[PDB]
Amino acid sequence: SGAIYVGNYRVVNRHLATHNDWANLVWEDSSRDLLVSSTTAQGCDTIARCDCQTGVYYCSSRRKHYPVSFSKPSLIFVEASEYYPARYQSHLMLAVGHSEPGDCGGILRCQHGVVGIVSTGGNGLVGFADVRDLLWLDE
Numbered sequence: 022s023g024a025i026y027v028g029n030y031r032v033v034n035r036h037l038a039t040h041n042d043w044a045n046l047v048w049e050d051s052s053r054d055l056l057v058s059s060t061t062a063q064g065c066d067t068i069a070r071c072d073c074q075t076g077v078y079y080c081s082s083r084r085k086h087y088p089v090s091f092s093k094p095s096l097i098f099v100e101a102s103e104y105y106p107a108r109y110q111s112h113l114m115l116a117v118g119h120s121e122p123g124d125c126g127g128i129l130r131c132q133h134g135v136v137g138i139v140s141t142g143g144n145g146l147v148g149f150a151d152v153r154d155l156l157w158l159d160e
């Protein structure tokens with residue numbers, strides 16, 4: 022679990038969105054596993070606007086942060102799960118690192134701010150949904 026809180030927005034994994042997220046929906050994209058909802062409070066985070074390929078992410082299944090080298094946002098095949106049919110997920114970045122199903126929502130950050138959130142994983146890999154191209158989150 023986890024979310025990004027920026028301005029009057031809450032960014033979460035679309036497959037983990039609550040009834041309240043859907044009732045206050047701003048934007049969602051099943052191909053990116055992202056959903057953004059509106060909030061009444063201002064929130065704590067800032068978004069990176071950069072091309073970093075190294076950063077640090079929070080891994081809830083180890084209660085620890087780990088440094089990672091990650092690929093550029095791209096279209097990657099993701100096997101069927103209880104949440105989605107087999108499909109290509111877009112704007113996804115892979116890295117070698119530990120992750121388990123409940124780790125989705127963990128934040129990836131570089132020196133410039135929040136880069137994205139944990140969205141996929143398995144066998145010593147961890148996939149992050151990029152948020153750096155969503156320029157409207159800052160206004």
Ligand SMILES: NC(=O)[C@H]1CCCN(C(=O)Nc2cccc3c2SCCC3)C1
Pocket residue numbers: 036054099102103104105110120121122123124125140141142143144
């Ligand atoms: N973005 C998606 O389509 C996700 C939706 C939730 C289920 N999917 C996962 O990749 N879950 C997951 C996360 C982290 C680690 C492991 C897993 S499943 C296998 C064991 C490792 C696909």
Ligand SMILES: [Zn+2]
Pocket residue numbers: 069070071072073131132133134
């Ligand atoms: Zn950066």
